[PDB]
Design a protein that fits this description.
homodimer, 429 residues, alpha/beta, Alpha-Beta Plaits, TIM Barrel, five-stranded mixed β-sheet, elongated, ribulose-bisphosphate carboxylase activity (chains A, B)
Amino acid sequence: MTPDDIAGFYAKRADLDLDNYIELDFDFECAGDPHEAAAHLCSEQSTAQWRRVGFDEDFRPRFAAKVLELSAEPRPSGFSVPVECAARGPVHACRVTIAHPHGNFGAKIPNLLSAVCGEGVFFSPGIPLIRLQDIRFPEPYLAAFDGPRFGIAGVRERLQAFDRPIFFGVIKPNIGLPPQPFAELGYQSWTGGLDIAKDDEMLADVDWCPLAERAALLGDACRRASAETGVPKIYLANITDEVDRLTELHDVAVANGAGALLINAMPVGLSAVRMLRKHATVPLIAHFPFIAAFSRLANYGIHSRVMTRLQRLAGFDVVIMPGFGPRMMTPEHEVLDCIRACLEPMGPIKPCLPVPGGSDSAATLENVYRKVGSADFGFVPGRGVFGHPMGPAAGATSIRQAWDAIAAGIPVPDHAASHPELAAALRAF
Amino acid sequence: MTPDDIAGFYAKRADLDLDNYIELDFDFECAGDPHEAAAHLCSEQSTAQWRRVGFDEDFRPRFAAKVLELSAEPRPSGFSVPVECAARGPVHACRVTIAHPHGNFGAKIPNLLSAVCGEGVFFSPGIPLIRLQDIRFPEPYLAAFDGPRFGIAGVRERLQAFDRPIFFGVIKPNIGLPPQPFAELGYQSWTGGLDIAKDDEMLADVDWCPLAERAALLGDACRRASAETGVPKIYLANITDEVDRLTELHDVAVANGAGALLINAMPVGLSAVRMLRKHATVPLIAHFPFIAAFSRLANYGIHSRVMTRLQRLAGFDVVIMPGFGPRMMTPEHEVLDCIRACLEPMGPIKPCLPVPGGSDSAATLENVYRKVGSADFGFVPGRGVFGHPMGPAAGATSIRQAWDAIAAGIPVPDHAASHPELAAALRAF
């Protein structure tokens, strides 16, 4: 890569059939020439070797990732965090858009990842810190996946929930409870006005609270509350387990009255999800364990937005992401980039429902709605429904009322002056 | 967690049946009391809520992760990297050992991860930066997995390779070559003295070089070279693909003479590997795309050693990790912690073979052997075999000779004075 091999790794937009390429945005820091560095980064990520021994061959035009656009400013301080490097001289901070020919891997999630962030990206020579900021896919490519089966669209219709956010609740306590008093809490929160009562991320099929039995009881409690309130209610059962057992658990949960399924997206593997999507009959919902390990630092890793794109692409109808509140340690606009990622038009792929976490209560709803900009989101209290002083039923109610205020454009604490549950929650949280 | 709920999340070694617990080592930074912080971290990771409404219940002793040991020193500077936080006052740097009751998830990889590094760990209140440094499992728990089928033990016997490192080679170029001139390069490198010729991480089943045909030709070239040298040779086929197609590709490759299979561990999902292990008939090898995104930074994420433990545990017989050389941007001792991780006695789980990456040639072999401490490792040149001036056959030879020197305790450049291939390689690299 030292000579004028560098030339063959750059291209103008105008010159490429952009339909054969996925666009990538990297921010990175490198030592020495930032032009060499970018080329090296395309090289490692794709060709790396374009001739054979002594052939004039160059299969760069058909197979090499190519720099579309590059931007680099000096930083005499050195790298952001201390690391250790294969180079000296100046250090630059860079922004690159690379066009990667997708014909290289075809339409499979595992192969995509291991190209756009395998060896190529992280062990490129002289580039210690690097962060993938976004992917863009062409229609032809997107057309190969199915994305969500339902989307916000579908989910809304299953709940008869229109022009208002979807109200989730994580039953608490979870870990430690046998299956019976579990249905109790769920039952109540639904009556109070919850749409969906969900299992905690860390609660699947275990000795002390088997899924077989949880779902049976919660399915009942669900059909019971649904009939008694006349509005459809939904039990969201966590079926996170070894990949082979995923299909088995889908059936067990659905047979027992589970309205939707929750999977821990990263731990099981996105490819796993895509396979369940082909078989699943109810909406699929992603939780966020693990994503944080590689998405938090601003100068390194992969932007959580990229994940969101992929989760949507893979088949999730709902994406639980980290939300607002300072207790969530994620930059404001970063969260919004994800909410955008979920809802953005994306070729034939349906928009999925974003669900910002954080310790939410009747008090924080007003805020989330302001910050989301519209009613197209989920809302997931834990305490604040099950933690409410008046009990779970009233905790749910408190949210419903908090909403009632916003939807009528009445500021919240005002409405709270005439509704005991909403007032209690404002006091408590 | 504000009151003396804190008490129930600490325990002395002496007090616990350590067999019910997995030990975890976290390094983190927190704001305000480090004692509250650690308790919160156990809480979030497990119980978080141990009563119901108004019951004296406390199911902390059976279900809550517990602080065995804690260590915390002040840092007036604030956090290492700039972040943003839910707290003020002093900032402390901490080291904790937490015992997590594994009865919480049972013996399943996805559930393990989503506890020991889901919400609990990364969104614990007032703890922005955190790194999982090590896991330790009890026999009872370990006994539930099978770990590697073959191990170094098995791999050594397949190759008749004893008392010397296993010599791998990544065929180059890869991306861009049709299947025919591929077999050519593989054939030669085996004849030169390579044990295993492998596909690049980024080369699976694609239009321009389908696995059906690669493996057919390379299987031939392998049987051919194996007969001609009288020593067993092996073709290592990459079968990275969508989870459901994994079983199909095992069969296609094995049927075609593939001696071992390579999977990209992270992109496919570790749960996926574990399922393949139940069905695979040849050794399994893990490559390292993606691990870097969450393991590089010293102050945040998950130490790659933890990954290695899990890969071994899942079923890999060989783990390709990032190696030495500065071009690899990983701390020396970190690489060694992984080499240790692979070989360490681990209950009924077999030791698997560690394979340090880096741009290795006949020149670096002497070094790796000194640094590994023994002959129990793989060695993976790319160029340096296929890049060698005299051609691939001679490139393989150069390594073989480099080894011959070491095994006789003759310093390398000395032996090179009488072997043209070793000399050329020393010049070239």
